[PDB]
Amino acid sequence: RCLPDGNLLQTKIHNIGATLVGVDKFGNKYYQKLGDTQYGRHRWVEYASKDRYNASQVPAEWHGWLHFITDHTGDELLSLKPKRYGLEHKENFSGEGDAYIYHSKGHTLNPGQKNWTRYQSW
Amino acid sequence: VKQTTGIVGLDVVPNARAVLIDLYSKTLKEIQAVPEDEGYRKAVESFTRQRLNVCKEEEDWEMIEKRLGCGQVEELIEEARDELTLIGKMIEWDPWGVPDDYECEVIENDAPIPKHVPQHR
Amino acid sequence: DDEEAEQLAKEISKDWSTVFERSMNTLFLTEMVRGLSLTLKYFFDPKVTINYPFEKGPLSPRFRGEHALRRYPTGEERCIACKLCEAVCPAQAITIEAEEREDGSRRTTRYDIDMTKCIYCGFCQEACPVDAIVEGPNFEFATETHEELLYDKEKLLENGDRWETEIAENLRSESLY
Amino acid sequence: FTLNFGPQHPAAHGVLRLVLEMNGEVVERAEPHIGLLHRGTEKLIEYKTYLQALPYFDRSDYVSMMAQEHAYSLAVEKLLNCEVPLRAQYIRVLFCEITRILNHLLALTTHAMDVGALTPFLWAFEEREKLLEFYERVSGARMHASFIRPGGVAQDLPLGLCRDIDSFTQQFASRIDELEEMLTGNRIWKQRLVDIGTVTAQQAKDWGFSGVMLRGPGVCWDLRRAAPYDVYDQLDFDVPVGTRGDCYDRYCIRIEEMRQSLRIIVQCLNQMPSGMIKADDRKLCPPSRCRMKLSMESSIHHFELYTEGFSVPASSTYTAVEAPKGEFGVFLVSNGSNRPYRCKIRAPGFAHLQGLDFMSKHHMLADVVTIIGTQDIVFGEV
Amino acid sequence: LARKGTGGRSSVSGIVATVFGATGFLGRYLVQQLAKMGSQVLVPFRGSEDSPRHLKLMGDLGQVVPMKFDPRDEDSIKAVMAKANVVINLIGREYETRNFSFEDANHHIAEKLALVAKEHGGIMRYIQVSCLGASVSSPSRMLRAKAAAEEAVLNALPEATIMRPATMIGTEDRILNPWSMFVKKYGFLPLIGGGTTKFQPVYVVDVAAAIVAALKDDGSSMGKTYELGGPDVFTTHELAEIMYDMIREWPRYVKLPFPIAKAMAAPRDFMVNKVPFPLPSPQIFNLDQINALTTDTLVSDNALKFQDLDLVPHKLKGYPVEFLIQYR
Amino acid sequence: PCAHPEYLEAVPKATEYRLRCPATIDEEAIVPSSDPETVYNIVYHGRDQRRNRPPIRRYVLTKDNVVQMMNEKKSFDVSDFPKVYLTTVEEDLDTRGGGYE
Amino acid sequence: AKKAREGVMEFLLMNHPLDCPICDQGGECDLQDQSMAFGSDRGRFTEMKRSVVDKNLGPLVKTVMTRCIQCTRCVRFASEVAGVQDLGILGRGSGEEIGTYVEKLMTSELSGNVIDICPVGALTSKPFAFKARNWELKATETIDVSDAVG
Amino acid sequence: GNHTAKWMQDRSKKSPMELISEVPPIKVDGRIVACEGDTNPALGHPIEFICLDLNEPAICKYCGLRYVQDH
Amino acid sequence: VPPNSANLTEARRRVFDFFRAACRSIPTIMDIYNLQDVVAPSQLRYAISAQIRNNAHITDPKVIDLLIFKGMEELTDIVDHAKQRHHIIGQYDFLKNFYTSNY
Amino acid sequence: AEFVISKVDDLMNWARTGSIWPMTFGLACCAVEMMHTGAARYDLDRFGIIFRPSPRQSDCMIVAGTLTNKMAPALRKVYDQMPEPRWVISMGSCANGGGYYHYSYSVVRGCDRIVPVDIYVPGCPPTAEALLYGLLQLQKKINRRKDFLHWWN
Amino acid sequence: KYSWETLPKKWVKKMERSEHGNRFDTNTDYLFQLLCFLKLHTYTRVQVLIDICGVDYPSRKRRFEVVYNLLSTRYNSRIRVQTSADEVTRISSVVSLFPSAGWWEREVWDMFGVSFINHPDLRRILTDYGFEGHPLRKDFPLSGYVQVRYDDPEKRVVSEPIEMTQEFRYFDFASPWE
Amino acid sequence: AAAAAAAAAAAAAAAAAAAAAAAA
Numbered sequence A: 001r002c003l004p005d006g007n008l009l010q011t012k013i014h015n016i017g018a019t020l021v022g023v024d025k026f027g028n029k030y031y032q033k034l035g036d037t038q039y040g041r042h043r044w045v046e047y048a049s050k051d052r053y054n055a056s057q058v059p060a061e062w063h064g065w066l067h068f069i070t071d072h073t074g075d076e077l078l079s080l081k082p083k084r085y086g087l088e089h090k091e092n093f094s095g096e097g098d099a100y101i102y103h104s105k106g107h108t109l110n111p112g113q114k115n116w117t118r119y120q121s122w
Numbered sequence B: 001v002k003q004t005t006g007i008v009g010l011d012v013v014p015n016a017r018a019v020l021i022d023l024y025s026k027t028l029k030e031i032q033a034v035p036e037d038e039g040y041r042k043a044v045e046s047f048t049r050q051r052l053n054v055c056k057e058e059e060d061w062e063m064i065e066k067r068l069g070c071g072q073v074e075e076l077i078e079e080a081r082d083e084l085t086l087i088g089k090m091i092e093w094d095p096w097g098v099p100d101d102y103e104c105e106v107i108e109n110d111a112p113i114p115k116h117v118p119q120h121r
Numbered sequence C: 001d002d003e004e005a006e007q008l009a010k011e012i013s014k015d016w017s018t019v020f021e022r023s024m025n026t027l028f029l030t031e032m033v034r035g036l037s038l039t040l041k042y043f044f045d046p047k048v049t050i051n052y053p054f055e056k057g058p059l060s061p062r063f064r065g066e067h068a069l070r071r072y073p074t075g076e077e078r079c080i081a082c083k084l085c086e087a088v089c090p091a092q093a094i095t096i097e098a099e100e101r102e103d104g105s106r107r108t109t110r111y112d113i114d115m116t117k118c119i120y121c122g123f124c125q126e127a128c129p130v131d132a133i134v135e136g137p138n139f140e141f142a143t144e145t146h147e148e149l150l151y152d153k154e155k156l157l158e159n160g161d162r163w164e165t166e167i168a169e170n171l172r173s174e175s176l177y
Numbered sequence D: 001f002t003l004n005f006g007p008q009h010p011a012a013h014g015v016l017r018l019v020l021e022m023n024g025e026v027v028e029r030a031e032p033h034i035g036l037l038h039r040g041t042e043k044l045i046e047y048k049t050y051l052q053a054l055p056y057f058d059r060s061d062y063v064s065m066m067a068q069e070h071a072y073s074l075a076v077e078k079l080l081n082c083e084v085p086l087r088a089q090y091i092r093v094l095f096c097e098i099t100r101i102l103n104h105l106l107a108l109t110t111h112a113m114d115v116g117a118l119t120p121f122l123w124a125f126e127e128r129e130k131l132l133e134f135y136e137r138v139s140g141a142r143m144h145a146s147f148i149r150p151g152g153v154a155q156d157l158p159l160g161l162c163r164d165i166d167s168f169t170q171q172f173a174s175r176i177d178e179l180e181e182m183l184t185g186n187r188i189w190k191q192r193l194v195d196i197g198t199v200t201a202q203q204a205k206d207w208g209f210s211g212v213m214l215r216g217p218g219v220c221w222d223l224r225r226a227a228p229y230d231v232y233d234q235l236d237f238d239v240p241v242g243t244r245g246d247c248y249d250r251y252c253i254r255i256e257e258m259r260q261s262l263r264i265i266v267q268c269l270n271q272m273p274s275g276m277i278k279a280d281d282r283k284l285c286p287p288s289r290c291r292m293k294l295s296m297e298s299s300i301h302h303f304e305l306y307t308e309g310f311s312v313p314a315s316s317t318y319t320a321v322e323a324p325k326g327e328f329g330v331f332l333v334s335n336g337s338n339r340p341y342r343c344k345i346r347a348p349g350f351a352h353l354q355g356l357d358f359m360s361k362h363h364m365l366a367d368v369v370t371i372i373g374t375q376d377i378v379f380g381e382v
Numbered sequence E: 001l002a003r004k005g006t007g008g009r010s011s012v013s014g015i016v017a018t019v020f021g022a023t024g025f026l027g028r029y030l031v032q033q034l035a036k037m038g039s040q041v042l043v044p045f046r047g048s049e050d051s052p053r054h055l056k057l058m059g060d061l062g063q064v065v066p067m068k069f070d071p072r073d074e075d076s077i078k079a080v081m082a083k084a085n086v087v088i089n090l091i092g093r094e095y096e097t098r099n100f101s102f103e104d105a106n107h108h109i110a111e112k113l114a115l116v117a118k119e120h121g122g123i124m125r126y127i128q129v130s131c132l133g134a135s136v137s138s139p140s141r142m143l144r145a146k147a148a149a150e151e152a153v154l155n156a157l158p159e160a161t162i163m164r165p166a167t168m169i170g171t172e173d174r175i176l177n178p179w180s181m182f183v184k185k186y187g188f189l190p191l192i193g194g195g196t197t198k199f200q201p202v203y204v205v206d207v208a209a210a211i212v213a214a215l216k217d218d219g220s221s222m223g224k225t226y227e228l229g230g231p232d233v234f235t236t237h238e239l240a241e242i243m244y245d246m247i248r249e250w251p252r253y254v255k256l257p258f259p260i261a262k263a264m265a266a267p268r269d270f271m272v273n274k275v276p277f278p279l280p281s282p283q284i285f286n287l288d289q290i291n292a293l294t295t296d297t298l299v300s301d302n303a304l305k306f307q308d309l310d311l312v313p314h315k316l317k318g319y320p321v322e323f324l325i326q327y328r
Numbered sequence F: 001p002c003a004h005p006e007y008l009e010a011v012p013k014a015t016e017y018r019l020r021c022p023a024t025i026d027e028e029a030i031v032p033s034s035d036p037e038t039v040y041n042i043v044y045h046g047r048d049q050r051r052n053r054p055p056i057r058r059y060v061l062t063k064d065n066v067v068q069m070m071n072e073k074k075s076f077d078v079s080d081f082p083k084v085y086l087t088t089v090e091e092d093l094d095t096r097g098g099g100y101e
Numbered sequence G: 001a002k003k004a005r006e007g008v009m010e011f012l013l014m015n016h017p018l019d020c021p022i023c024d025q026g027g028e029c030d031l032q033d034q035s036m037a038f039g040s041d042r043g044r045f046t047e048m049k050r051s052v053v054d055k056n057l058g059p060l061v062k063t064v065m066t067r068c069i070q071c072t073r074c075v076r077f078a079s080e081v082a083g084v085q086d087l088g089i090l091g092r093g094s095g096e097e098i099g100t101y102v103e104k105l106m107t108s109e110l111s112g113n114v115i116d117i118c119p120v121g122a123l124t125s126k127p128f129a130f131k132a133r134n135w136e137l138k139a140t141e142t143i144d145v146s147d148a149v150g
Numbered sequence H: 001g002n003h004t005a006k007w008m009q010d011r012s013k014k015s016p017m018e019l020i021s022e023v024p025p026i027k028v029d030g031r032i033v034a035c036e037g038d039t040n041p042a043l044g045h046p047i048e049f050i051c052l053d054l055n056e057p058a059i060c061k062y063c064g065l066r067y068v069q070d071h
Numbered sequence I: 001v002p003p004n005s006a007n008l009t010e011a012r013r014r015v016f017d018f019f020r021a022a023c024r025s026i027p028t029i030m031d032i033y034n035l036q037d038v039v040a041p042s043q044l045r046y047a048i049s050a051q052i053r054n055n056a057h058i059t060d061p062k063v064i065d066l067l068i069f070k071g072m073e074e075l076t077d078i079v080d081h082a083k084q085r086h087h088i089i090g091q092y093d094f095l096k097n098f099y100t101s102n103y
Numbered sequence J: 001a002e003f004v005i006s007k008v009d010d011l012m013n014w015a016r017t018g019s020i021w022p023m024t025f026g027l028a029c030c031a032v033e034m035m036h037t038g039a040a041r042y043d044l045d046r047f048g049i050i051f052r053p054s055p056r057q058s059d060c061m062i063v064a065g066t067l068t069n070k071m072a073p074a075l076r077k078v079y080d081q082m083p084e085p086r087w088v089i090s091m092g093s094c095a096n097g098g099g100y101y102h103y104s105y106s107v108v109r110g111c112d113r114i115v116p117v118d119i120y121v122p123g124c125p126p127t128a129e130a131l132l133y134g135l136l137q138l139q140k141k142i143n144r145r146k147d148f149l150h151w152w153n
Numbered sequence K: 001k002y003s004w005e006t007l008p009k010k011w012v013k014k015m016e017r018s019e020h021g022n023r024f025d026t027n028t029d030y031l032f033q034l035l036c037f038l039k040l041h042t043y044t045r046v047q048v049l050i051d052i053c054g055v056d057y058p059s060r061k062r063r064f065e066v067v068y069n070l071l072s073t074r075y076n077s078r079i080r081v082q083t084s085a086d087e088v089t090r091i092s093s094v095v096s097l098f099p100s101a102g103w104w105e106r107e108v109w110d111m112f113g114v115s116f117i118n119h120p121d122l123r124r125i126l127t128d129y130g131f132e133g134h135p136l137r138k139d140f141p142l143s144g145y146v147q148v149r150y151d152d153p154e155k156r157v158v159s160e161p162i163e164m165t166q167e168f169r170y171f172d173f174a175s176p177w178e
Numbered sequence L: 001a002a003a004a005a006a007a008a009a010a011a012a013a014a015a016a017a018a019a020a021a022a023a024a
């Protein structure tokens, strides 16, 4: 706890009756409080980064279960993530310095700014 | 006896039959100024005669509506007065008679229409 | 006429113990105390709200969010460069340039969806023959700068490999439609 | 005395830029300024195929999305002669009517938030966030569900959508009652709305209102009873028609039209035939993913329908449905090619917002936002 | 340069500039010229990321790439000038700040950018911007520093253009906007030295148009210290006469002898002393700006003027001063 | 004392609603594409709708034709007139079905 | 007539592979534009289509003979107009394969026009391997200056 | 590769060309294969029938998978 | 306004009418947009006349009607504060091209 | 030491990130989605965001919908009268970049042509949560300000 | 159809259709006179101008085609009177009959350029204030001529310079064999 | 000002459907 400075207190006021369904690699604890009441508020995630958290830290294995699109906890879709090309999540580093943010291939901030001139000069 | 036309603005007229007779007599008298061999004059004459007849025969506005099945006598008066306007307008900028050439192209297509589209009922 | 309409609409409610009913329902504001009572019932009822970052709104496997170029289970980008999505795109966001790679099988040298110039209508997901381009349920990719929001040629749309675990699920559940 | 009455509350009436020529507090004329939301829709559609043209329609009226896709689809089936199944018609109405509810839930309580009642807005928007759980579930996008395609409808309902729409319809009479108990009885409401923007029927006809502003005045005219364009000729529902024309009748209609739309939703649910979802004519309806991959002749059509298009034959029709705003009609001239040709979009709010000039004459300046309320003026269509 | 376009705002001009002083009053016009004639601009900012936000527009999707850099730390200046062929230098201060002294902000930086551009062989044109009359033995330590900056940018890097703009007028300037908001001391304008100063202001748009014109020019304008003077050689009092024409106010000047001013600006000159508090940027009374105000050397001599850039400056009446209307 | 006649008891908070989350395929839908009679009988020109239409017959009327038609139209007897779309209003509170649809 | 056309366009699309997305001539295809205009909207063939290896016809004509419908247009063009007589309709039945029986690059010039002759993607420009599509290409009715035939 | 050096600047994750050139060719029985896609004929590419008359493996154009006759 | 231009004479008459209108309206133009100091009335009259003369070779009457209508539109949107002012101040050989582009 | 400066920046940023009232230029549907992001389910009054109806007192400006070439001067005039610690959020494809109407003559190719933008909510009809996450990214942009440390240079 | 018998033959001058909604392609001179008919007439009562659709056929000689839609709330029918007026032909305005025609004709003139006779307040409704050019024509390019607008040193002002953008990619989907 | 004031009196609420309740 010790955060009376966030809405994280609203999540920690949840979890009082909720059951913990799995926890992904990053530490985000995925909770479920069904049966009681208030559909739409019976699946959430405790981000395990009580500060500096934001959305999109929820990996794709769980981002289904947590938006109610599926009923497969990330401990069940982890047997379906492709091993050959599977890639870990990236938290959406939007703005947090260059080389973390994404860059196109001509942005002059991207190492290896490609030239698009279709004609090959002499 | 009519309480009100559901339509807003079309105020209920108590003397519906009388003003209808007046308007249809005015229409029959004013339509004489258009050439006889024009579809407009045949139409005006025919339906004005039918409505003037049914208005003279029946007495109540309700019976006028019931026999002359054209909605409500207030809307009927609106139609008759608008028709008088049109006949007094048609006298001016007289469009009667077909000109010499008169190239009219009946592009009468007949595409089958699916009927789950609106059209009308 | 409005004068007579008023006279009659006030001669409709003109019998004692009806004038009294209307007077005690316009003096002891009674229509309004049924407003306050309902408002109170809702002041005490549970709240339909969602503390967002921790729990998010319900979606569906058909939900159209961040576009992701899928891959075949054995690597090999699924995107053969037919350009059907570049054609079907209403906003013309996708710019595809194709080159026979050295292996010999066609592939897109440039597959750049411009997310800002993109309407998220899912036409690309429908038009693509092999399900190469699909919309990942991400929808959380607000970018500090516009240039990042233009998704590069097959490199950032290739981040769908992370979302494949959810995209493959949504496709396995939607393909029945 | 000229006053540049702009958007009082932004995010509700976005680009409203009236220029009121007032007289103290009495408005003498209201001159709306259009074009602040004039995206090139009636030009951009001439440049794209009949499929690419459909997403513009959900973006024409932003509070009642699928009604315009349904008005466009019925204008590229009027030409195509593309007979759609019974299930496509029933889904198409169950969503045109869910859209009527999604619009009246907004255009009532956004109006009721401009008048001042703050809570009906948020209750109706919880209801709308329940109905967008249906839009978003059946197509994908919560608002712009490019779902009612020309032939039939994009793709079948999920296997749990009618149960959820039922579990919503059971609890939706109560929400309308609350929106009604909170606003209909109030003396602060009636006072703010009775005899406001009264439109005699001759005026609502003259100015081509043709919506909930043509049934306020008492003109019984609903293009679902006049020109039944779907199962509407099978579905039972009563069109509420006002008797005075004041902004309190149009509210009472929009709050009854939100119940008859509930009747139509419950009917479409209780009688939804298990048939094909799109027209069997695979040269107007792209074949399913399963078929185009397995069948070579389906793959060719999936290629020439997602690149070339229909190429609907040469004609010109005005298909008008009863969108929630009013008679939303799309006059679609069609050169033989696969791209439309001057897909003109008659959108109510272009004819209604004309009415603001005479509706809000001699009304007080604070009424000019109530008029804009009951006209359901959404500037995407204007 | 390698220009492939028609006008700008999507064209290319082969000028991937790094306008070192872009997040500044001169910088916003120069960046807009360079990125409206369609050329990349690598605007380097010093602190708050809100500084170059007004420059993310006026350039089309990466034509203006604001970058972070520390003025005293190299290996970051080299990173800002990594992909660049033009390097303009607008880094200058009129007031000493407790952290960066006059030399460490006017001379010891321009020399540093000059050296780290020399090392990064490929900077075709390096423009160096310093005030007019910034010659050694000028009273204002700002002009002595700005003269040493010219001498060190030419030595350490020859064929490097040097604009010499005189006090530049325009919106958000440091010459007229302090006088207004001091006319808001009830029309009280304290023209110092009695308005005997003779200085030639110039519409900042035209200083920018000259800074870009030495880029679009040929091999010439290299190592040639221009003097972007402007028209209508004015006097401080006379220039103030034109402000009161725009801002509707009645001329109510006063004269201040130079000792009185230098005593009134004796505070805010303990900048190096008052360590635990930064002073609020002396706007009108600046002991160094006053030392410059004393001698009217701010006049264009026979050195290169706008005429040697096919360019003629705008006047100082009408639009090029119509930013004062916002004070009426 | 309010809008609660044992009917608001249908309350908005559902708590058991979308019990089967959408992407969970408990039942695999089928969504028929084509009618069974049109699977192994793919003759199209009979089923065609785009192109299976009568061609546009645009024939010109000259003055002779229209004066002939005007003389042929002897009289506008009833049933040569467009029928009115008759619609009257009628007050009804909840009688359709009893308020239950 | 229409039933005969639909019949034949079903046979052509019967053993034809679903290569339209990966076919270089996907947009500019006689088979696609005749199926989408005169051929039936559906195909009843649900069996094992025949497939054909890709012959090496040089660094100009990329060959995918599985797509080729064996209409014989190219084997006539090389015999008559190009006049080199290298292409052939080897075999009979569905096993018909168009191309040189021995690996033989089409040494004839004027034999790159077989791609425009070809009503199907099968024979396509290998230089224009996949680089573009029939709809992206903005066309100008220019002339040529390589040889003086203009 | 060089084509893959135009869109991928990572150069640390294996290039898709190698990811498909390192999967072994699939033995089969007849002279024609299906390669409907991954496994599910509705989640793979349009079915592409490949000929295995040649001795070398015949790649599937859409998926890169390789098939050999296995006589 | 109905196109009474059944001849170039009526069209020219209403051209002079529009010219008199614009000239007699120049006061408000100079006032609302503050050009009474940058531009002289002679110069604004010069510009209006150079406009009406730049398009003087129009042997078509209806085209002149439409030109006068566009001009009245421009004026009415300049008189009122519909358009801004920084354009009104702006509204008021081969080798040197070759060196710049190829077009 | 510098720690006091670090904490005073943390405090200023906590203020400007807790109460960030945007002038919601709600043009078009993304204003209807923004109204859903202001509605009961995704509260914006929870995160402090109070939709101001006037540009005068507002920390942000969530331009949504198609910025028309005619509503460009009005948007610029509104942006010029926000108090300096202001930010702009582009919501929807039409507002952030050219969008469905990139090639429309009357539509500016993204508000990035009129106002300088700080967070572009992506997705043409962004999910109400997506606009909410865009605002939770604007909150990050505040938490990376440290204006006091820069005032001390 | 009853409407064609009564209507003066000269008024339905050029054309007449009989499906997809019936139309009376009339002449521009007899238009408002034809719109006076079909309204204020007992057996043809439209009263409701639904729409005024400018349509531009560049290959015609009378380029535009001002398609007046008309609903008849009384008889439940819809008639589409049309016209044909090129770029410099002022066409009669029917704002006097159906006052809804005001804004529709402002839009027809704005988009196309078909000025309307005796139409009070005929002023560009949709396009920008200083807009020159008529968008919904055919020869008007999609991206517009000078219609980019960006901020600049002319502060608080968005200029209107010549336009430059990612080139709109026109796809030639149209296939032979129609 | 002689402008017509909004008189908040009217006829009592009576839901007015169309005549097609039972048999069209």
Ligand SMILES: NC(=O)C1=CN([C@@H]2O[C@H](COP(=O)(O)OP(=O)(O)OC[C@H]3O[C@@H](n4cnc5c(N)ncnc54)[C@H](OP(=O)(O)O)[C@@H]3O)[C@@H](O)[C@H]2O)C=CC1
Binding pocket: E020, E021, E022, E023, E024, E025, E026, E027, E045, E046, E047, E051, E071, E089, E090, E091, E092, E093, E094, E100, E104, E105, E129, E130, E131, E132, E165, E166, E167, E168, E169, E173, E174, E175
């Ligand atoms: N203003 C005038 O009237 C005149 C000015 N000039 C010269 O023009 C140039 C630009 O003028 P103007 O923009 O108005 O000047 P400013 O004082 O407004 O500063 C402009 C730029 O200089 C940068 N800068 C200044 N000192 C430093 C430093 N120590 N470290 C890092 N960056 C620094 C500023 O960064 P930041 O914004 O972060 O502080 C800003 O980017 C200067 O050389 C100036 O002396 C010429 C004639 C007179």
Ligand code: SF4
Binding pocket: C067, C085, C088, C089, C090, C091, C092, C093, C094, C113, C117, C118, C119, C120, C121, C122, C123, C124, C125
């Ligand atoms: S959803 Fe796909 S097809 Fe549609 S605009 Fe976006 S990228 Fe293009």
Ligand code: SF4
Binding pocket: C078, C079, C080, C081, C082, C083, C084, C085, C086, C096, C108, C127, C128, C129, C130, C131, C132, C133, G021
């Ligand atoms: S994403 Fe789909 S449509 Fe686009 S090139 Fe790849 S396979 Fe073709």
Ligand code: SF4
Binding pocket: D300, G016, G017, G018, G019, G020, G021, G023, G024, G025, G026, G027, G029, G030, G031, G032, G067, G119, G120, G121, G122
């Ligand atoms: S030739 Fe190519 S594009 Fe045409 S039908 Fe055959 S595979 Fe498809």
Ligand code: SF4
Binding pocket: G067, G068, G069, G070, G071, G072, G073, G074, G075, G098, G117, G118, G119, G120, G122, G123
């Ligand atoms: S021209 Fe093409 S399709 Fe015809 S036989 Fe030759 S290879 Fe086959």
Ligand code: SF4
Binding pocket: C119, D059, D144, J027, J028, J029, J030, J064, J065, J066, J091, J092, J093, J094, J095, J099, J100, J123, J124, J125, J126
């Ligand atoms: S970007 Fe899409 S959702 Fe947003 S306003 Fe534009 S059309 Fe609507």
Ligand SMILES: [Zn+2]
Binding pocket: H035, H036, H037, H045, H048, H060, H061, H062, H063, H064, H065
């Ligand atoms: Zn394969």
